[PDB]
Amino acid sequence: GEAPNQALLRILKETEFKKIKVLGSGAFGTVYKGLWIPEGEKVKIPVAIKELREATSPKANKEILDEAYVMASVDNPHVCRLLGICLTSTVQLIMQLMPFGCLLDYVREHKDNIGSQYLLNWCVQIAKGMNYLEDRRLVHRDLAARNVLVKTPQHVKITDFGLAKLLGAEEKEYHAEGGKVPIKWMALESILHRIYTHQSDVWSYGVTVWELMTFGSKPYDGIPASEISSILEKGERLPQPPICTIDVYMIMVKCWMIDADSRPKFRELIIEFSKMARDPQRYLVIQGDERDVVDADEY
Numbered sequence: 001g002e003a004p005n006q007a008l009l010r011i012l013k014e015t016e017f018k019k020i021k022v023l024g025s026g027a028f029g030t031v032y033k034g035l036w037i038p039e040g041e042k043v044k045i046p047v048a049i050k051e052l053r054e055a056t057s058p059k060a061n062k063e064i065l066d067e068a069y070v071m072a073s074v075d076n077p078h079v080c081r082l083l084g085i086c087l088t089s090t091v092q093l094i095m096q097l098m099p100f101g102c103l104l105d106y107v108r109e110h111k112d113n114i115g116s117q118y119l120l121n122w123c124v125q126i127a128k129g130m131n132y133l134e135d136r137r138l139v140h141r142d143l144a145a146r147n148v149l150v151k152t153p154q155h156v157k158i159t160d161f162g163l164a165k166l167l168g169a170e171e172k173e174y175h176a177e178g179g180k181v182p183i184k185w186m187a188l189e190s191i192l193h194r195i196y197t198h199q200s201d202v203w204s205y206g207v208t209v210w211e212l213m214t215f216g217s218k219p220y221d222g223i224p225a226s227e228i229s230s231i232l233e234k235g236e237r238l239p240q241p242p243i244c245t246i247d248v249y250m251i252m253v254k255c256w257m258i259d260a261d262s263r264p265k266f267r268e269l270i271i272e273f274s275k276m277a278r279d280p281q282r283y284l285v286i287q288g289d290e291r292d293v294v295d296a297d298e299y
């Protein structure tokens with residue numbers, strides 16, 4: 001029981017775009033800056049590009065072809081979509097350039113400008129996206145300040161569907177079977193059993209926000225991944241951010257529950273911040289508080 005997909009998937013000649021600067025690389029491959037110059041049309045277009053390492057590993061090719069589908073599919077003010085695809089040997093993902101870039105960086109810079117109404121209107125948008133994804137059976141498995149981008153300070157969108165896995169009908173979870181992971185982010189369920197759910201994704205929406213309110217701050221800084229589980233089991237978590245009123249910090253603790261269905265759903269995280277949004281100064285305390293290219297968003 002689902003309607004027609006009706007999404008577009010754009011295939012591009014490698015010539016239509018040119019990669020300008022390097023943003024990130026690991027084992028996967030690389031993500032370039034670059035700008036796309038549509039065939040025929042003389043109109044330059046800022047984009048970002050993720051190329052992959054290899055060209056012929058069956059499941060690897062399977063994995064990416066899924067990552068595309070998902071990103072093509074999504075349509076949400078706060079979810080980034082796939083512009084198109086290059087189907088060259090080492091497959092490349094074309095995707096819309098967010099000017100200001102990842103939301104982690106952005107708080108590490110502008111913190112002395114950054115204020116209450118924004119940090120709450122941002123959390124609302126992240127919840128909206130995650131809940132929108134939840135609406136469409138999709139699970140992320142890699143939330144983190146990192147994977148949120150800034151179109152404009154009054155608006156953020158969710159990127160990086162590289163660890164996403166879509167779920168079936170009766171299915172309510174997914175078991176991984178080995179792979180590189182962000183340990184100091186995913187849920188305890190996910191670490192000892194390799195289980196993931198939407199309720200695993202909330203947890204990180206916790207860590208994510210904890211990262212926001214602290215203004216970047218490295219989670220479990222120093223402390224390695226090799227007893228994170230043990231640590232959580234003993235019952236230590238990340239400490240109240242200074243600026244956080246207890247009302248807010250609480251929610252973070254609701255998301256670090258060892259019980260999965262005790263953790264707030266994105267449906268209800270949305271409201272807990274939309275509420276706080278109307279009176280942002282009574283939930284966060286930030287001293288000094290009231291102080292020929294084309295964008296592509298035209299088809």
Ligand SMILES: *[C@@H](CC(=O)Nc1cc2c(Nc3ccc(F)c(Cl)c3)ncnc2cc1O[C@H]1CCOC1)CN(C)C
Nearest residue numbers: 023024048050093095096097098099100101102146160
């Ligand atoms: C965050 C800095 C950073 O990487 N910023 C950044 C990312 C970005 C993306 N990301 C992306 C990721 C996966 C993927 F599959 C695709 Cl297709 C894209 N996409 C579009 N535009 C982006 C802009 C962006 O920023 C801009 C600021 C300077 O120039 C780019 C720090 N982490 C690396 C830890």
